[PDB]
Design a protein around this ligand. Sequence first.
Ligand code: ZN
Ligand code: ZN
Ligand code: ZN
Ligand code: ZN
Lengths: 406, 406
Amino acid sequence: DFVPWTVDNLKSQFEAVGLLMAHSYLPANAEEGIAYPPLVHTYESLSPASTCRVCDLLDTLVNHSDAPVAFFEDYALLCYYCLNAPRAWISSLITGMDFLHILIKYFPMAGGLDSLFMPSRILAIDIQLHFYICRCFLPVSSSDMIRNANLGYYKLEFLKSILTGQSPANFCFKSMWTKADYCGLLLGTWQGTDLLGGPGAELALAITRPEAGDHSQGPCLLAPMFGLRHKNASRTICPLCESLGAHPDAKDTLDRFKSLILDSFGNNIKILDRIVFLIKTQNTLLDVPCPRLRAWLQMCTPQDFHKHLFCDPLCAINHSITNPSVLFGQIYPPSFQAFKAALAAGQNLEQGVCDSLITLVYIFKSTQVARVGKTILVDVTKELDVVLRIHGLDLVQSYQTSQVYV
Amino acid sequence: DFVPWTVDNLKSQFEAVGLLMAHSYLPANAEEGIAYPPLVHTYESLSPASTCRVCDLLDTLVNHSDAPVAFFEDYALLCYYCLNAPRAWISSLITGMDFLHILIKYFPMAGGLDSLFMPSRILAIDIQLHFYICRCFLPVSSSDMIRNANLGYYKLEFLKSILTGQSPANFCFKSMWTKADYCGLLLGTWQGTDLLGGPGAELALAITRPEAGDHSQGPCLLAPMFGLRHKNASRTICPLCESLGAHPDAKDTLDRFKSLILDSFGNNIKILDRIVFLIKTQNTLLDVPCPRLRAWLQMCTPQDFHKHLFCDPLCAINHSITNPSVLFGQIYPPSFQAFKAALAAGQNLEQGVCDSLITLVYIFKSTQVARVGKTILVDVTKELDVVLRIHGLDLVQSYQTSQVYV
Ligand SMILES: [Zn+2]
Ligand SMILES: [Zn+2]
Ligand SMILES: [Zn+2]
Ligand SMILES: [Zn+2]
């Protein structure tokens, strides 16, 4: 009956997504003012000795009387879907909305599920920290909590570094270490600087904005970079990584585009020039089925295509971990209950990507965004190169894409 | 019908070469003034995320209707010639003029081919960046754009370093890494300080000069060093490397001169002394056929002969890559169309020199001209020595020729 990533489950809860997207703007003034509640709650959530608020809520609910069965099955299904989504803005939003839907469905007698997304309660950074960064649902053996704890320390330290804007104090790298789109939601909001492209029922109902925060950067705190800075006409919220999660025909379109770039030229023209030419003269952003897709896609600067396709490591992880047949595909009903039960017992939740790889990617993005020295950059670049080559990817040398794009 | 390096194709387009040589003077005042248009356009062209203007023009022309055939054949012929020319001033000028000739011939309905060489359009640095530095016409396999992109980043960074006058900020070397002469054109212009030698229809029609720029350094921005600085009576525009490209009997004359130096002495006299004696007492710069050649050659200080013949690496690359039989020799007509067609399909365009070698040479010239530390100079010297010895050359140790000549 319930299946995640169904747009209806989000279209019927606008009173909640409004409050979520309203409590996730960065402060308007550069200086915090007096004390911006979302930022202080986030800084408390990234503490090294704090408790995951999602797990805390789950235990204060389930460990009461008569926790209904099939709740663990719906939770396992939501976790299986979040295991196959790109780390981006639309993914966090959809996960939050579907989590709230499950809670309102099965546990109606709970206390404050009508105001869940407020400070001192579950917010966006908590949803990310539970479902995507340091996932808290994969089955693990008892003798395997040590390496995970250590990598968790490094993860959280460098995330706090990304957020605060200054590299960690004490760290030397060496000697350490369902068929329905969402494009209306993306195009509806995001009238800030997130497009900068050529020009510049979801769209109608996606019009609201707060005032206490910077309404030019948009809902940053949902993104996996906690901000929107841009250099050389490339930004820290890759819109292609939203398209990967907001439409079924996006990953295949980008694969076809990459094949065209690689194969439709014989000269030694630089790849950015190939992209600019394929987009400019022989328009390949018109022969796309959805009007909203190619309307939100033809307003992406070619530097962004270059970054996403050939340069950035996080975009490669997204492009290689998503699976739009699971997010926008029906499941054989005769096997549905069997699959639900198998997930409840923890049988198919495959890790996906490694954990050292994610920590290394976050370290790299931290040194790419915030300030950094030299002897750490030149070394994290080499290590990222070797690890990415091992794991089965092929991107340009990382020093270039660390000094050119942001 | 059309063949490159024919002096007639340049003698009939003086209204264009005048504007090209007028828009390529360094600014008169040391400080830019307000904003010197050529310099700002160049700084935009050496950006790490910009588009090659030559390829952009070629696509905005050819990818329109009825791009005539045999245009790709003439373009392939021009590229084959530029594949066999010395990196110098006369080479860039001739390539620009012949490119404009081809464009005016085949694409007459184009928009502004009468004012092509203006700022915000094709200029000299763009011609160099297309035809000589990071050549954009060699056929390459699809799986070979990565190493090329990385080397391109380093190339452009250190070229910008040569131009701006300060070494790159973030760089640690270790842990990284047709029978008709042109001599009238050279002797006609270049009444600045480019000769400093003994004394001090092309020449008649080579008299024009702008006023907004430094008319003492001459058209620097065509050279491969973007300036004319000189130390110890040796300059950064090697005139011998112009002779290599402006006369058929130049490479053989210099080879004979080198053989005389090496073989006509038994004592242990230093090589600069051998040069000074061979030029002074037993004049060997009179028994030269062309009057213009030995008139423009006997005004070259012996330090310059020494540099070009035995010391500098770029001059060795020039002396070993040029091929004056291709630039000043007729082709067997029964095979002309076959050769043109074979070039159009990309069959004979051999790379020539490596790409790491060119990047290393530019790094060396950058540290030789601009400011630099120590731990980078002493190491690039060793690496250049080893690479040059591998590639089949024999020059003096590079530290000396880095501290003595400029
Ligand atoms: Zn948790
Ligand atoms: Zn992306
Ligand atoms: Zn080019
Ligand atoms: Zn020379």
